[PDB]
Design a protein around this ligand. Structure first.
Ligand code: 3PE
Ligand code: 3PE
Ligand code: 3PE
Lengths: 144, 240, 192, 468, 48, 48
């Protein structure tokens, strides 16, 4: 948080990448650094590699790599996931007669439908378009 | 409730009046995310995109999603509807249907051509009965090894149908020819025929089987694509 | 026993522990490794005529050399020798007491004044109607050089003088104590 | 994709137009589901995406309602829509797992370390050249463009003199402009979140930085103006690396009537003109689906060689000869020549670029090699037996040719009608089906007309040079 | 330690249950939140 | 093998009379004699 894309590339992505070199069946590494302080490393493996073994070996190298990061980065915590960007299905939720409001639909999807479907057999990841309810405190600087 | 949050105490002033949360901010129920805007056919809508898990049958997971969703659908709020906006599985079903149709057409056409040559119905039924035994046995065997019914193994079967009737066509043809040239009982003619053509049968099978073997041993994505053809074709050739 | 599973299991059981460790220990970093294979070769980097500073050689190897060699066809791991330098503040008790300052005062001033600020976006998502522009807002706040540390304001003297860090400490880019220096044929050098 | 620094409202209006266009296609489109602020390139307010569902294939039978047809009508859209950077309708890959979209995927690397500006200049040259190359369409960058950014310079000297700590500045400005999730409250038995952030009116423009105050060590409030300045800059939002090297991604489509390989070639020639334009030391890499394509094309020669070798060796072992295997492999080109001829002719007359040198063509070629060898063994093994019986090479081989001409022809025509339905397939995977079908049918024909003549001649030549 | 079943649920059990999707071969989950402060989550996987 | 070591003994009572806390003494000598890592800066893209 707070760093420029160039600082991110210099201090996070390059060191994680340098540690990630040397994995068993690796094909190519694609990476990006964003001005909002976010780093992304994508590891593509060769055909016929076990995905679970790939994940655990990434974690085994990342364990030691994490000590070489800035402390601000270590505080947020770095995460390891395996998935494919494409989508199998998209479901839509809507009100045909407008009885139910958009915020009601969105909160209901987030509260009642997302978690059970993401535990369905064979589903890898679930992306949601629409937010759930939250308590917002909107401050006025002048009054503060 | 928001009124409760509005009432959260902050401090006291030098005069002594208290400052609460309402005194410096606006309190409300809002979203936990504001960065997207979704619509279905131009109307506000929520969306759930599902991504499949690392080597799982898409058709199975789609059916499972639908079952779970159908169970959930009972407790919907009044005025809630769902509908698939983007699904790929109908195309899969359609392509499988098509490939099976081609297989059926091919078996019919092979029957017709060989009945054109082996003009007898008794004659031509003998190769025709080989099609089921070989096709079903091939399915069984490759299923033992973990292969599935995809378009690649089905293209392989369609490609095999014309080659799997070869040994039988050869066998029958010799017997019929023998029975025409020498008019003897079918048993004697068939024994003489099998004595004559064993080497032809083995050569035919040997070359056809050897041709597809090497591609089974290739790596990569291309190797996975090759292996379906190789295994299916080789198994049928031996069974034939 | 699969070495990868043994390592992952050990470092998963480690996660339970760390919340009980000392905070100093946590910031240094707890690392887990396994035995594995040995060195194929060890390379050394040095300047024959002492023209370049050892620090310059260390920087050059760490920047240019270390990353591309990792990417050579058969390499498994790449380890540098020589560690890296650190910023070091050496206190003087006499000067500290003359101003009635403590070590904790210096620690607090160091953490307060060397920080990274975050400022969000222009036109963030719930935006005022008719908002035209959406842009990132980055701030530069961390100290960059050693003179910036030397000038860290500490306090004000009764006569009005400005007591900064330089008035009680010696500021110098120094070594990281944990890893010590390595020398090739009796001269400073860095190895891979 | 919208221009840099565009808000969610502009993106929404562009997408409203895009929605109207697709829904007004009543004969082809059924539904469209759009999201503003989301793309595969990343999350950001100037990006959007739409999932368009067509009507059932049975309903769409007119050329006008084919998928390619709609893509062009929509590709007009980005030309008409003014605010957008581009609006590209795209198609899915044949195997959706291997990529997100169809087309080519290239990674341009700065393999000589010349910096971000030089790499962007090279990419702009490439885009310009690709735009006017008639074999390509829709060539675009897959990422984010350099954007204006606001930069805040905090005076540490003034801040320290004023009594204000940079850590307190971080806390105040971070919570005020960015927002923070503090803790949870429970709604209807569900745990939900509590967020604190400055109100929208105080966080829109750089003037609104002057609204916020920090409390110093003395406990008084000092305005943000007292220790920070702010300025407008120009920088990259997102930096990319491909294999340890700074890089940018370029994607696009083959033009109608052009094959995937031809487009890839086209792209490469364009990349080849960089050194002559004063741009040096840039290399590319063909990632993703393009990578898969290149690897498949490459290994066909080994596959053909290995198949031919194994057949040669099995023939040698079975018939205890070396002449018979050479005879049989000598007739393989007659079988193979039909496959290539028919696939090429079908491509040119049909206008279909799917009839190409793809991976289904390779299996068809292997099948044709097998058919060729089978036809030859049938006659030569019988001729060899007849010669063992004590008949002349010429007489025995002519006799065997005569006797086996009937089963050969019927087995070959069996194989030929066995694949005819694939070649004459229509819809739902017809492309691959036609590849296999056309290859095998051409092979069958040339083997049935040229091969049958060449089998006996090669046999007699070889056995005459090597007698007995 | 020190907590009631309600606070255990709210502060631990649902927090940890909301992360437990995406696991391969999962059948069902059982949880309980006790008045001694203890939280249990048992994840059951498919055969094989 | 064992080596000589030096031990500091702080008189809680004398410190009390002198009006100095135990925690202050501990922090003082922790920082002065033991050293402390505070936070890091980026020096030309290198974390130090
Ligand atoms: C005459 C012209 C040509 C006619 C075409 C058939 C020619 C002979 C070849 C027979 C082999 C057919 C192979 C079919 C492969 C289908 C592959 C497939 O996609 O599977 C579909 C289905 C399994 O999946 P699902 O749809 O989920 O169904 C399960 C619940 N039913 O699969 C199933 O449910 C089971 C399907 C069983 C297939 C039965 C085939 C029986 C053939 C019997 C021949 C009898 C010969 C005469 C014998 C009598 C004496 C002379
Ligand atoms: C006896 C001669 C038999 C020739 C059969 C034809 C095999 C063939 O198709 O050769 C083409 C292949 C190169 O074809 P291509 O994949 O386009 O590479 C460029 O080139 C080869 O595979 C040559 C293999 C020679 C053995
Ligand atoms: C043109 C074809 C010429 C080659 C040929 O016709 O071979 C015949 C010759 C003798 O063969 P044969 O009469 O069976 O003893 O063949 C020979 O004399 C010996 C040939 C040995 C072939 C070995 C090939 C090894 C290839 C694997 C590598």
């Amino acid at each position: 948080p707070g760093a420029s894309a160039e600082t991110v590339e210099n201090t996070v992505t390059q060191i994680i990448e340098q540690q990630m070199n040397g994995l068993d069946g690796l094909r190519y590494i694609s990476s990006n650094s964003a001005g909002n302080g976010q780093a992304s490393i994508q590891l593509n493996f060769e055909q016929g590699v076990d995905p679970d073994i790939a994940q655990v070996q990434v974690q085994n190298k990342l364990q030691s790599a994490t000590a070489l990061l800035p402390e601000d980065v270590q505080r947020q915590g770095v995460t390891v996931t395996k998935s494919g960007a494409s989508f199998l299905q998209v479901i839509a939720f809507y009100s045909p007669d407008n009885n139910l409001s958009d915020s009601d639909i969105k909160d209901y999807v987030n509260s009642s439908i997302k978690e059970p479907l993401s535990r369905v057999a064979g589903v890898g990841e679930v992306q949601v378009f629409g937010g759930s309810y939250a308590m917002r405190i909107w401050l006025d600087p002048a009054k503060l | 409730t928001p009124e409760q949050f509005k009432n959260i105490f902050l401090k006291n002033t030098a005069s002594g009046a208290e400052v609460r949360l309402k005194d410096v901010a606006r309190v409300e129920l809002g979203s936990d995310n504001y960065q997207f805007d979704s619509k279905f056919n131009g109307k506000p809508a929520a969306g759930l995109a599902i991504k499949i898990a690392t080597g799982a049958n898409a058709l199975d997971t789609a059916e499972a999603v639908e079952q779970r969703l159908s169970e959930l659908r009972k407790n919907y709020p009044t005025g809630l509807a769902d509908k698939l906006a983007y699904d790929t599985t109908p195309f899969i079903r359609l392509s499988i249907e098509s490939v099976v149709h081609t297989l059926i057409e091919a078996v019919i056409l092979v029957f017709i051509v060989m009945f054109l040559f082996l003009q007898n119905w008794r004659a031509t039924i003998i190769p025709t009965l080989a099609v089921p035994v070989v096709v079903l046995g091939t399915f069984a065997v490759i299923n033992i090894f973990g292969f599935s019914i995809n378009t690649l193994t089905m293209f392989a079967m369609v490609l095999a149908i014309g080659l799997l009737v070869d040994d039988a066509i050869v066998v029958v043809e010799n017997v019929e020819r023998v029975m025409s040239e020498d008019h003897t009982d079918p048993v004697t003619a068939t024994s003489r025929s099998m004595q004559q053509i064993s080497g032809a049968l083995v050569g035919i099978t040997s070359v056809l089987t050897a041709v597809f073997v090497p591609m089974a041993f290739f790596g990569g994505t291309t190797g996975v694509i090759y292996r379906q053809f190789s295994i299916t074709l080789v198994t049928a050739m031996v069974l034939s | 026993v699969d070495p990868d599973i043994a390592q992952v299991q050990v470092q998963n059981k480690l996660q339970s522990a760390t919340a009980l460790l000392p905070e100093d220990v946590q910031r240094q970093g707890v690392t887990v490794t396994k035995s594995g294979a040995s060195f194929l070769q060890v390379i050394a980097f040095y300047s024959p005529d002492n023209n370049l500073s050892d620090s310059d050689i260390k920087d050059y190897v760490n920047s240019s050399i270390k990353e591309p060699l990792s990417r050579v066809a058969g390499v498994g791991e790449v380890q540098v020798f020589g560690g890296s330098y650190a910023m070091r503040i050496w206190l003087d008790p006499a000067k500290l007491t003359s101003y009635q300052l403590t070590p904790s005062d210096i620690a607090t001033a160091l953490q307060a004044q060397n920080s990274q600020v975050a400022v969000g976006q222009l036109g963030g998502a719930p935006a005022v109607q008719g908002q035209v522009l959406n842009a990132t807002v980055n701030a530069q706040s961390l100290l960059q050089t050693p003179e910036q540390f030397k000038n860290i304001f500490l306090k004000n003297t009764a006569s009005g003088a400005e007591v900064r860090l330089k008035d009680v400490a010696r500021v110098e880019l120094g070594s990281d104590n944990y890893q010590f220096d390595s020398k090739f044929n009796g001269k400073p050098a860095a190895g891979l | 994709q919208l221009p840099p620094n565009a808000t969610l409202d502009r993106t929404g209006k562009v997408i409203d137009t895009m929605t109207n266009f697709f829904m007004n296609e009543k004969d082809t489109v059924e539904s469209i589901f759009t999201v503003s602020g989301f793309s595969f390139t990343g999350v950001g307010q100037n990006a959007g995406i739409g999932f368009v569902k067509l009507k059932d294939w049975s309903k769409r039978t007119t050329p006008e309602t084919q998928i390619g047809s709609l893509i062009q009508r929509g590709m007009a859209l980005n030309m008409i829509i003014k605010d957008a950077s581009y609006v590209m309708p795209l198609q899915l890959p044949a195997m959706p797992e291997l990529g997100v979209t169809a087309g080519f995927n290239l990674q341009l690397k700065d393999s000589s370390g010349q910096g971000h500006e030089k790499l962007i200049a090279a990419r702009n040259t490439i885009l310009g050249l690709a735009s006017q190359d008639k074999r390509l369409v829709g060539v675009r960058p897959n990422g984010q463009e350099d954007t204006p950014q606001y930069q805040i310079n905090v005076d540490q000297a003034q801040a320290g003199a004023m009594g204000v700590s940079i850590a307190e500045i971080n806390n105040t400005m971070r919570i005020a402009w960015g927002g923070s999730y503090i803790n949870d409250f429970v709604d209807r038995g569900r745990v939900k979140k509590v967020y604190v952030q400055g109100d929208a009116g105080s966080r829109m423009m750089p003037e609104d930085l002057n609204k916020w105050y920090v409390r110093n060590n003395k406990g008084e409030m000092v305005p943000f103006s007292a220790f920070a300045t702010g300025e407008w800059t120009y920088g990259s939002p997102r930096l990319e690396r491909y294999n340890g090297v700074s890089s940018v991604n370029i994607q696009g489509t083959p033009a109608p009537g052009v094959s995937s390989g031809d487009a890839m070639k086209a792209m490469e020639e364009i990349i080849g003109k960089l050194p002559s334009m004063g741009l040096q030391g840039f290399d590319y890499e063909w990632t993703g689906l393009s990578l898969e394509e290149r690897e498949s094309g490459a290994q066909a020669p080994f596959l053909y060689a290995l198949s031919l070798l194994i057949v040669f060796l099995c023939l040698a072992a079975l018939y205890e000869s070396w002449s018979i295997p050479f005879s049989v492999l000598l007739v393989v080109p007659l079988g193979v020549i039909g496959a290539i001829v028919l696939t090429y002719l079908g491509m040119i007359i049909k206008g279909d670029p799917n009839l190409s040198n793809n991976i289904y063509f390779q299996v068809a070629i292997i099948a044709v090699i097998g058919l060729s060898a089978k036809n030859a063994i049938l006659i030569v093994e019988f001729a060899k037996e007849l010669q063992e019986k004590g008949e002349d090479l010429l007489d025995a081989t002519l006799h065997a040719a005569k006797m086996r001409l009937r089963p050969i022809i019927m087995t070959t025509l069996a194989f030929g009608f066995g694949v005819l339905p694939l070649a004459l397939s229509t819809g739902a995977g017809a492309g691959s089906q036609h590849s296999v079908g056309f290859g095998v049918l051409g092979g069958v024909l040339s083997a049935t007309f040229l091969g049958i003549f060449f089998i006996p001649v090669f046999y007699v030549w070889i056995r005459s040079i090597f007698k007995y």
